[PDB]
Amino acid sequence: HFWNRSGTMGDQLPESLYIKGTDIRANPGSYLYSPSPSGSVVTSDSQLFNKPYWLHKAQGLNNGICWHNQLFLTVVDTTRSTNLSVCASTTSSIPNVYTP
Amino acid sequence: RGQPLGVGLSGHPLYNKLDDTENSHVASAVDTKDTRDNVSVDYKQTQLCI
Amino acid sequence: VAKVVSTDEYVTRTSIFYHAGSSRLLTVGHPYFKVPKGGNGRQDVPKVSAYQYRVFRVKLPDPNKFGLPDNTVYDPNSQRLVWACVGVEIGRGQPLGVGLSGHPLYNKLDDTENSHVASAVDTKDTRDNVSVDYKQTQLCIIGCVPAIGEHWTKGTACKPTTVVQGDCPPLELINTPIEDGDMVDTGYGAMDFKLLQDNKSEVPLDICQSICKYPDYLQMSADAYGDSMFFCLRREQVFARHFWNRSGTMGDQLPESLYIKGTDIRANPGSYLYSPSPSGSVVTSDSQLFNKPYWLHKAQGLNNGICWHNQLFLTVVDTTRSTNLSVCASTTSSIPNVYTPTSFKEYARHVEEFDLQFIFQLCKITLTTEVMSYIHNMNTTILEDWNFGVTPPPTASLVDTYRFVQSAAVTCQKDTAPPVKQDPYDKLKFWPVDLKERFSADLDQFPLGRKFLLQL
Amino acid sequence: KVVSTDEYVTRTSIFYHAGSSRLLTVGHPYFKVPKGGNGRQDVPKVSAYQYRVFRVKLPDPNKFGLPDNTVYDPNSQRLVWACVGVEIGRGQPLGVGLSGHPLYNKLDDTENSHVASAVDTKDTRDNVSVDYKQTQLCIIGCVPAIGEHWTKGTACKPTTVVQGDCPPLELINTPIEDGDMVDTGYGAMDFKLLQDNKSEVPLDICQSICKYPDYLQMSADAYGDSMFFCLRREQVFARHFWNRSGTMGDQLPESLYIKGTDIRANPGSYLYSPSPSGSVVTSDSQLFNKPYWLHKAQGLNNGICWHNQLFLTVVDTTRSTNLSVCASTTSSIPNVYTPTSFKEYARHVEEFDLQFIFQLCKITLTTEVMSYIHNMNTTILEDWNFGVTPPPTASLVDTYRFVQSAAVTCQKDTAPPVKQDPYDKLKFWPVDLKERFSADLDQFPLGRKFLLQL
Prior knowledge:
The structure is cut from a larger assembly and holds 4 copies of chain A.
Chain A (H helix, E strand, L loop, with lengths): L1 E4 L17 H4 L6 E3 L39 E3 L23
């Protein structure tokens, strides 16, 4: 989704750009245009892994050799993405009329 | 990798929204400094490894 | 006959193989214009907003005259020397990214898509602030020479007479060489927008004062000897986001004959100018072309991939990265506790990063006569630039030269006069690319190279 | 039975390239507007919603370059073209655009159906803009082609005919011509039958009529002629639903539902109507710019321009814009915006680039075959060589002189034929290409490809 964010321009408007209008359009307004990004959709396909990696050959000159017996594994995943909500009643009793 | 899959949001209460410059529907506004809108949001799907 | 010679029909191909590759290119500026700060060196914030055709004038060194000649491999004297790149992996910068462009005084009659209410006031200047994207697109063009785009204009009212203020001209289509930073057409105007709209009240501001082209691949495919562009790669997608009808005078009129009239506004139907809003669609990384070897073999070009004058014209498009960035900078050195935007000056810039990477084969070409001379007739110039019988040149000029400057008041002709052969594309802007050291044979040591070797 | 043609059509080594340098034609979306003359000056109507039909003039090879009569005995043989290879080069970038209608009736929606007028009685109508299906077509033939289409049928018993009344219904087959309005999926029907309203649905088609091409017929093609190649591909969805206004001449039964009260006692509209729509495009899915040399057209015809006549068919849903010129009415623009200040205009563009590869066949002519052939049509024979296939003559009949008549036998007119196909009453993008015949082919991209494909 698109908005423009309100703000105050620290960067400026050529007029030489639009025909003016009146007032609110004699000078117009903002140019702070801002969208929302969004992931898209999931399905089971799309997990990149749980698949064997046989190495055959590293892209780099070292072919994956464990100096200092120290290994560095990098990973990123959206798929699971979530947090859990605890609704704890503030009441020990649970009112049988709700109140937030 | 464990778990099922799942997704979610992050938000912002004090958002500086100008306006929807999208369908800009119904219509557009003018000003205030109480520009501090409550907003929730998502972003890009990603899996990466090195 | 004109009959294309076709590289290979005399280019002695070799065992020569080379690497080249560009470490990072980087630049930032604003989504529209240059915000000048009075100039000159530099003191301006330019534009940076890559929806412009990207031309790297890509320079390599003279293989002819590398230096030393046991010439064991070859007699330049017969077999003059030339590059051909074979394999390329351009390493592409950044995450992927995206953004928005708009126009506050973007007209509109109405959102005639499926408006909730269909009100239609008849007052002017209701042109509001709307922003949008474009067709998701990746293209590259590779060539020995630059490229041509084509685009329109309000063409000549070549009718004898002249006519009415605001009357529709006839519209004439124009070919032009594409140049670095040339603005892309995006979905809307291989033409002169700026000309086209007397109003300046429409489209996204960025193109208001614009002209673009669309690349002339087809003519460029129709290339004289399969040169110019000898390689080209292209990928584009889109859909329509939302519908309007524009506001504006119909400069023509609707036939009645389309309807049973109604009453009033229905007796008299309103505008017929229906106008959508674009969008490129979702991105997955998957569809990014970039970052793989494009080994080339045969190609369309009947120059199979060579550059005299060491220039390859690397021409490119990517929609996967669009944003100029927002700084909310306080006007106050205080950070107030009640936030007002007003306590903030807010700023916009986009930034761009790059690597070209290569695997070449230099090839050597033995001078053949009713063919070399044909090449002269292809173009002599190179050939001059490989020269031969009698340069000719001129001693008195040659001696003279560099003397002056070590001062600026003493002698103050201060380089009024030049000396070039001249590249006409001097008048054109490139991203100036040279690589005369990215030169390597360390294929092994070259990402692409490794692949390449592997590619063997 | 008809036969595969090479059978009598002698194959060769002949290869040619020929290819169109540019096709271009431009004008206003929905209509043409006279701009005086009106030989010629006008605003043509141009929309890419016009059917692309090429009448292609091609070398009578029997008079052509490299006639080296290794080629034939010209007597016993005729020369005949086949183009063998085709690449339709498509102009412009891709694009699109929309249409609309102010007097687009609209009763309503169906979900934001939380209120209904429900009469209006007048006309409802609002301004509307619109989209339609993704579609890519090719059809190649040496004969122009026919589409299929609709008409309100007619009161076979003119009995009980009622004023602007529902009618019995007819399907019509007709030849398609160049520039002929394309069908997005409707106009194989008359509008000017359809809506007695003539103001309902989109303007653009409002006063139109189309047909849709029949492959089936054209695979009921007698020899593979107007179709020796055919390709069609469409994807589509419905964008939005509605109900249009309309005094239903149809009747909905009561029985079907409970009456409630009021509005919910009475019935409402059943004129469910929804949006057409294409969706997302990409070049990935592009049909054109593809090289056929074709191994075999499913036609018995091995793709021959009879009489050096070729018929090229195409459809492309990927550019759709006529462009809006904002020209100020003011000497120079003012500073405040007013629409007045600008006269705005709509114009469309189409370019095409054809590249081709031919192989001629030489024909040893043999009697029966010729005869055969003559039975295909004769104009054929008439092309070169002339035997009196017309005779007989007769089998014998009738008395006929009298025709000085007079009041003594008021007989027959009788009308003559004009020939000249019919095509001549009809339109193409006229295409002479006997100039583009290229004997090197490599200077044709496709030629190389083709060459390569060998």
